[PDB]
Amino acid sequence: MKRTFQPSNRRRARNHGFRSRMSTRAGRSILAARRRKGRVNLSA
Amino acid sequence: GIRKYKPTTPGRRGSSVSDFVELTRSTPEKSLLVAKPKTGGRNNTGRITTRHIGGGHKQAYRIIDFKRYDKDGVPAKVAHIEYDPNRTARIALLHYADGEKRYIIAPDGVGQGTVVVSGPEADIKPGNNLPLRNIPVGTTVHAVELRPGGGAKMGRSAGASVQLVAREGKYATVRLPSGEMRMVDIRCRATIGEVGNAEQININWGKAGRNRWKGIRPTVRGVVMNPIDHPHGGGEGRTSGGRHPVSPWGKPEGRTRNKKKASSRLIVRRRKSG
RNA sequence: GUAGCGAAAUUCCUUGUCGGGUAAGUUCCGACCUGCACGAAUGGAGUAACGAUUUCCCUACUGUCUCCACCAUGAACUCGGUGAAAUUGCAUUACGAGUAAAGAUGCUCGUUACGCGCAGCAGGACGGAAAGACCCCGGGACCUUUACUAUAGUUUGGUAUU
RNA sequence: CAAGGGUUCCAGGGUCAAGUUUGUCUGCCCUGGGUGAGUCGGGUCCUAAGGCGAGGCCGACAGGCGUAGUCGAUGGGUAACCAGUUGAUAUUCUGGUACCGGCUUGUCACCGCAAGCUGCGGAGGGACGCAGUGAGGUAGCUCAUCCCCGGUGAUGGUUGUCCGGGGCUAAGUGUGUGGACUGUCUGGUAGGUAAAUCCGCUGGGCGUGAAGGUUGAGGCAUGAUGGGGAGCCCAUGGUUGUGGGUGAGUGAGUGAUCCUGUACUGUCGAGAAAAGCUUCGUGAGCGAGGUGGCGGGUCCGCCCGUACCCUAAACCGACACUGGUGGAUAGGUAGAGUAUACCGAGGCGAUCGAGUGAAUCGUGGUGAAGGAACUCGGCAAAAUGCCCCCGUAACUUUGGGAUAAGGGGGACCUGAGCUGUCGUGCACCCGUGCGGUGUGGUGGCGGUGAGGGGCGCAGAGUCCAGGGGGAAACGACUGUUUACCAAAAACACAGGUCCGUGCGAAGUCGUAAGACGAUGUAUACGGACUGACUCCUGCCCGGUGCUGGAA
RNA sequence: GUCCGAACCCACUUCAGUUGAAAAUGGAGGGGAUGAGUUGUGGAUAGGGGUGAAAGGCCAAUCAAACACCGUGAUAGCUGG
Ligand SMILES: CON(C)Cc1ccc(O)c2c1C[C@H]1C[C@H]3[C@H](N(C)C)C(O)=C(C(N)=O)C(=O)[C@@]3(O)C(O)=C1C2=O
Ligand SMILES: [Mg+2]
Ligand SMILES: [Mg+2]
Ligand SMILES: [Mg+2]
Ligand SMILES: [Mg+2]
Ligand SMILES: [Mg+2]
Ligand SMILES: [Mg+2]
Ligand SMILES: [Mg+2]
Ligand SMILES: [Mg+2]
Ligand SMILES: [Mg+2]
Ligand SMILES: [Mg+2]
Ligand SMILES: [Mg+2]
Ligand SMILES: [Mg+2]
Ligand SMILES: [Mg+2]
Ligand SMILES: [Mg+2]
Ligand SMILES: [Mg+2]
Ligand SMILES: [Mg+2]
Ligand SMILES: [Mg+2]
Ligand SMILES: [Mg+2]
Ligand SMILES: [Mg+2]
Ligand SMILES: [Mg+2]
Ligand SMILES: [Mg+2]
Ligand SMILES: [Mg+2]
Ligand SMILES: [Mg+2]
Ligand SMILES: [Mg+2]
Ligand SMILES: [Mg+2]
Ligand SMILES: [Mg+2]
Ligand SMILES: [Mg+2]
Ligand SMILES: [Mg+2]
Ligand SMILES: [Mg+2]
Ligand SMILES: [Mg+2]
Ligand SMILES: [Mg+2]
Ligand SMILES: [Mg+2]
Ligand SMILES: [Mg+2]
Ligand SMILES: [Mg+2]
Ligand SMILES: [Mg+2]
Ligand SMILES: [Mg+2]
Ligand SMILES: [Mg+2]
Ligand SMILES: [Mg+2]
Ligand SMILES: [Mg+2]
Ligand SMILES: [Mg+2]
Ligand SMILES: [Mg+2]
Ligand SMILES: [Mg+2]
Ligand SMILES: [Mg+2]
Ligand SMILES: [Mg+2]
Ligand SMILES: [Mg+2]
Ligand SMILES: [Mg+2]
Ligand SMILES: [Mg+2]
Ligand SMILES: [Mg+2]
Ligand SMILES: [Mg+2]
Ligand SMILES: [Mg+2]
Ligand SMILES: [Mg+2]
Ligand SMILES: [Mg+2]
Ligand SMILES: [Mg+2]
Ligand SMILES: [Mg+2]
Ligand SMILES: [Mg+2]
Ligand SMILES: [Mg+2]
Ligand SMILES: [Mg+2]
Ligand SMILES: [Mg+2]
Ligand SMILES: [Mg+2]
Ligand SMILES: [Mg+2]
Ligand SMILES: [Mg+2]
Ligand SMILES: [Mg+2]
Ligand SMILES: [Mg+2]
Ligand SMILES: [Mg+2]
Ligand SMILES: [Mg+2]
Ligand SMILES: [Mg+2]
Ligand SMILES: [Mg+2]
Ligand SMILES: [Mg+2]
Ligand SMILES: [Mg+2]
Ligand SMILES: [Mg+2]
Ligand SMILES: [Mg+2]
Ligand SMILES: [Mg+2]
Ligand SMILES: [Mg+2]
Ligand SMILES: [Mg+2]
Ligand SMILES: [Mg+2]
Ligand SMILES: [Mg+2]
Ligand SMILES: [Mg+2]
Ligand SMILES: [Mg+2]
Ligand SMILES: [Mg+2]
Ligand SMILES: [Mg+2]
Ligand SMILES: [Mg+2]
Ligand SMILES: [Mg+2]
Ligand SMILES: [Mg+2]
Ligand SMILES: [Mg+2]
Ligand SMILES: [Mg+2]
Ligand SMILES: [Mg+2]
Ligand SMILES: [Mg+2]
Ligand SMILES: [Mg+2]
Ligand SMILES: [Mg+2]
Ligand SMILES: [Mg+2]
Ligand SMILES: [Mg+2]
Ligand SMILES: [Mg+2]
Ligand SMILES: [Mg+2]
Ligand SMILES: [Mg+2]
Ligand SMILES: [Mg+2]
Ligand SMILES: [Mg+2]
Ligand SMILES: [Mg+2]
Ligand SMILES: [Mg+2]
Ligand SMILES: [Mg+2]
Ligand SMILES: [Mg+2]
Ligand SMILES: [Mg+2]
Ligand SMILES: [Mg+2]
Ligand SMILES: [Mg+2]
Ligand SMILES: [Mg+2]
Ligand SMILES: [Mg+2]
Ligand SMILES: [Mg+2]
Ligand SMILES: [Mg+2]
Ligand SMILES: [Mg+2]
Ligand SMILES: [Mg+2]
Ligand SMILES: [Mg+2]
Ligand SMILES: [Mg+2]
């Protein structure tokens, strides 16, 4: 059937992209937390 | 007028439609249109603040001159009478005798070719716009300004009518279509005559679809909701509200006008009653 | 408690009573009113048309049935290849009448039974799957209100702005 | 093709793993290779929804909103086609022939408070719904005694039209047939943010009763002496390609979902924006007496994508999963059809098999007599089914009910006449040299056919394809709903009533500013209940609520 | 918001499946099919909140208050060890 994940690169980049995260202070703190943890992927 | 539909199909059975006899032109003036995207009843916060709004046929806004006093003394010919989807009245397209074209609410009785004018020395004819000090007492006007220079705000819908009853001092007393008696500044402008298309209220839409493309979404009455959704919600089987009638937000029925504002200019309340 | 309607999606008694339909009708349709406990915009009574709605009947039609038979196929079955699953205290795991935590393969007294497989059927192992969803007790959640205590909001007056 | 995937694509080597079996094979592994654009799809251009937002306003802080702006396609704008080639790429490379923008150059013509260029805006334009019919075309398709290239048949016949195949070419340019568009010459001018000679609004003169002009469905010409297109050659090389051998390009029927066409007609629910573009000036600067125009020549033309899968074994579903996935093309015969049956272009034989008349389960098939006796219940199945013609009840809101019900005919052979269209041809208007027009043609093709006839159990012979009637309850109706046990009598609904709201509306979101309501104004808006329509809607204000009043 | 009927959308009945081909489907029928239709792309509304032709429905395969992390080794007169 139609499943939950329907990919769209533009929507993904607008939602979880680096600039989207940098727009708000919550996203900036998320990037900081991922940097502290050591993720190689800071954002989508 | 109104044209009654024949009962060929259900939903067309009791319905009716205006015959559009007064329209002289089936297209609008291109230079007086702006885009009017739909809101769906949503706020600038993106939430529904006015319910029951959405969908409907696409519409283009017609720029209506509700001031009329920046063309004082310039006669205009009523070039056309045409349809405005944004209102229950018709719109008269006016060709001023200087090249400027404009739109007004079409007064009842005016048609293609008649000459309208604005100003204190304007003649008292339907469609002419004058200050209230110059409009004679006992006259039926429309498109009345609350504050001088603010533009038309009262008596604008189809068939609307305002009665000028007195001009004592620096205030003119007007009976609004609600029947309320109100005082306004004599310098406030008004257009002679009443609004046309007065018979549109008798239109039977006869069809859920016609309001659906008029832009009205279905209305779910609160008594068939759940208690979390509406104070009238709940109950086993069909019930009443289980309480006195209230709004979906728990506000009891009652007068809601702010008792302390411009009440010093209201002579008597509308007196709907029964 | 009016018009209207009434054993009704409402009638407990109840398969009320009478009438129609059937060879036979607790359902049905028309009546009666004795309305346990109808009723007029939480609308009353009707209503052509509409309905994958509910109910009754007639006709046509048939394997629905009397009453099943036969045919072909995908599994099943045999051979070669590949190869799981839930479950699992144990094992060389009968029946009868008993007995016992009151329903026994396992205890008593008897009876029967050579060892091991294959295809099958589901009576039992209180079979498997889900720390019963009913009940009660403890806790929680959400909902309600003329429960308590508060509060946003709305409103009153004072005072500052004055 | 898009989305998504990301090297799966190609060649060679490999068979541990993966593949529901095997495997020499692979979408697997290993190595190397493969994607070429001024025109295609995006960016360099434009805006929609929406996002962000200099200042700004609002908010203890954090922040909210928003102006000027600036982004943002799913839309607007925008110049190229055919053929050929590779193991893998092709509106990209190559061939042929075009187009667009620059730079530069040759030549001709022209300007000069007064060139031009660039900014800046004005106006025009871009620019818009839904539904329907018809007309003129073309694509396509069919047929052919016509033109080509073959064939003469394993078994009776098969050298005449008997059989098979083919009967082709683009963008661009020119032409201007249908069709469409369009009076002309001057004057004035409260408007178009600064202006306008470009617009708008108005005054006159003349004016066919259309005549020119402008335009451009197709056709023709050109592009094209080219390209493409079968079987004959010493030969090739023997699952091969080379050089010659390419032959034809006819006519009719039928006919679009395409073109004219945003046409035309109908219609209420009244159907984006902005830029490019044309023109107008000048609220800006540049700029010399140098530019700007029309034909001709040279060079310059950027970035990203381009392989491959893609109604799927490569995407979304943990799988190489009977599921889901937007768009384009979509031939023949029977048919109303994009249904269905069998076929075409093309692609597949499906990723464990071999057997064997067990019971049994699934999936189909048939059935004597009976025909709902089954069962909670006609559940399932059967019957009915198509077209044409005849005919059709209670009731009704006059529309319906209705395909009511209930009947007849259908295919095959032959076939008189009637028609669609074309036709060499007759005469004729000819504006002929018109790409024409009306009479008019033995005929070809197609459609339709009264009548007559044949055969069978059966002629809508297969697939496909309503059972019908009577009555009651509920809801008027079409719709909507518990994704994953309830589709209903529930919700909605059109209609109705009451209450609120005089506009900074009430109401709602928010701390606020603001916003929706609404660029609406009481014939409106918000809330409540009721729920088409018909006839109606009684009595009670004590209680509670609401409204008003204030001793 | 006509009728019959494909695509398309739906999900009424039945059978099968129910360690499925499939964490909701398949076969046979069935409803809508010019409309309150359906669908693509992008966008908006966010957790006591959204949205809801209203079923407490839906909000990333279990919603009478999502998910993740944190307070946190919550607490449990209860069950187990
Ligand atoms: C008519 O009486 N019969 C005997 C009962 C019954 C009959 C038919 C059914 O189809 C179901 C049930 C019981 C309910 C129980 C429900 C319950 N829940 C509502 C709290 C629950 O606890 C679970 C669960 N997941 O544990 C469920 O399954 C549940 O939701 C569900 O679906 C049910 C059913 O399907
Ligand atoms: Mg998801
Ligand atoms: Mg314009
Ligand atoms: Mg915001
Ligand atoms: Mg509403
Ligand atoms: Mg409106
Ligand atoms: Mg409910
Ligand atoms: Mg509440
Ligand atoms: Mg309630
Ligand atoms: Mg009750
Ligand atoms: Mg009885
Ligand atoms: Mg009883
Ligand atoms: Mg009886
Ligand atoms: Mg009453
Ligand atoms: Mg009542
Ligand atoms: Mg009642
Ligand atoms: Mg009712
Ligand atoms: Mg009733
Ligand atoms: Mg009825
Ligand atoms: Mg139904
Ligand atoms: Mg019978
Ligand atoms: Mg088998
Ligand atoms: Mg085996
Ligand atoms: Mg005992
Ligand atoms: Mg025993
Ligand atoms: Mg024993
Ligand atoms: Mg022992
Ligand atoms: Mg055994
Ligand atoms: Mg067995
Ligand atoms: Mg057993
Ligand atoms: Mg058990
Ligand atoms: Mg327990
Ligand atoms: Mg449970
Ligand atoms: Mg259970
Ligand atoms: Mg509690
Ligand atoms: Mg919970
Ligand atoms: Mg105060
Ligand atoms: Mg004070
Ligand atoms: Mg790629
Ligand atoms: Mg590789
Ligand atoms: Mg790979
Ligand atoms: Mg490969
Ligand atoms: Mg293997
Ligand atoms: Mg290999
Ligand atoms: Mg290989
Ligand atoms: Mg730019
Ligand atoms: Mg914007
Ligand atoms: Mg700032
Ligand atoms: Mg820009
Ligand atoms: Mg952009
Ligand atoms: Mg390729
Ligand atoms: Mg090519
Ligand atoms: Mg080339
Ligand atoms: Mg402009
Ligand atoms: Mg427009
Ligand atoms: Mg022979
Ligand atoms: Mg041929
Ligand atoms: Mg001027
Ligand atoms: Mg000016
Ligand atoms: Mg035609
Ligand atoms: Mg490529
Ligand atoms: Mg390719
Ligand atoms: Mg394909
Ligand atoms: Mg698949
Ligand atoms: Mg996968
Ligand atoms: Mg045919
Ligand atoms: Mg088919
Ligand atoms: Mg083939
Ligand atoms: Mg394929
Ligand atoms: Mg496989
Ligand atoms: Mg066997
Ligand atoms: Mg059968
Ligand atoms: Mg037989
Ligand atoms: Mg029989
Ligand atoms: Mg028989
Ligand atoms: Mg019979
Ligand atoms: Mg019986
Ligand atoms: Mg029986
Ligand atoms: Mg049935
Ligand atoms: Mg059948
Ligand atoms: Mg009829
Ligand atoms: Mg009939
Ligand atoms: Mg005949
Ligand atoms: Mg027959
Ligand atoms: Mg047929
Ligand atoms: Mg009755
Ligand atoms: Mg009854
Ligand atoms: Mg209904
Ligand atoms: Mg209704
Ligand atoms: Mg329905
Ligand atoms: Mg829906
Ligand atoms: Mg369901
Ligand atoms: Mg209403
Ligand atoms: Mg307010
Ligand atoms: Mg506003
Ligand atoms: Mg109701
Ligand atoms: Mg009283
Ligand atoms: Mg009272
Ligand atoms: Mg009071
Ligand atoms: Mg319909
Ligand atoms: Mg689809
Ligand atoms: Mg269901
Ligand atoms: Mg089952
Ligand atoms: Mg229907
Ligand atoms: Mg978004
Ligand atoms: Mg409930
Ligand atoms: Mg969910
Ligand atoms: Mg909570
Ligand atoms: Mg909620
Ligand atoms: Mg703590
Ligand atoms: Mg503990
Ligand atoms: Mg325990």
Author numbering:
A (entry chain 1): 1 to 44
B (entry chain c): 2 to 275
Provide the publication's sentences verbatim.
Apart from the canonical binding site at the mRNA decoding center, the second binding site for sarecycline exists at the nascent peptide exit tunnel, reminiscent of the macrolides class of antibiotics. Unlike the ribosome of the Gram-negative bacterium Escherichia coli, Cutibacterium acnes ribosome has two additional proteins, bS22 and bL37, which are also present in the ribosomes of Mycobacterium smegmatis and Mycobacterium tuberculosis. Sarecycline (SAR), a third-generation tetracycline-class antibiotic with narrow-spectrum activity toward some gram-positive bacteria, including C. acnes, was developed for acne treatment.
Using local refinement on the 50S subunit and the head and body domains of the 30S subunit, we generated better quality maps of these regions at resolution 2.9 Å for the 30S head, 2.8 Å for the 30S body, and 2.6 Å for the 50S subunit. During 50S subunit EM map analysis, we discovered electron density within the NPET that is consistent with the SAR chemical structure. The second molecule of sarecycline (SAR2) binds in the proximal region of the exit tunnel, opposite the macrolide antibiotics binding site, near the PTC with its ring D close to the PTC and its ring A extended down the NPET towards the exit. In this position SAR2 interferes with the growing peptide chain, as seen when our structure is superposed with an E. coli 70S ribosome complex with the P-site-bound tRNA-nascent chain. The oxygen of the carboxamide group attached to C2 in ring A of SAR2 makes a hydrogen bond with the N6 atom of A2245 (A2062) of the 23S rRNA. Ring D of SAR2 stacks on C2768 (U2586), which forms a non-Watson-Crick base pair with C1965 (U1782). The hydroxyl oxygen at the C10 position in ring D forms hydrogen bond with the phosphate oxygen (OP2) of C2792b (C2610). We observed direct interaction of SAR C7 moiety with 23S rRNA in the NPET. It is hydrogen bonded with the oxygen atom at the O2’ position of U2767 (U2585). In our structure, the position of U2767 (U2585) is not compatible with the correct orientation of the aminoacyl moiety of the A-site tRNA, and hence SAR2 should inhibit peptide bond formation.
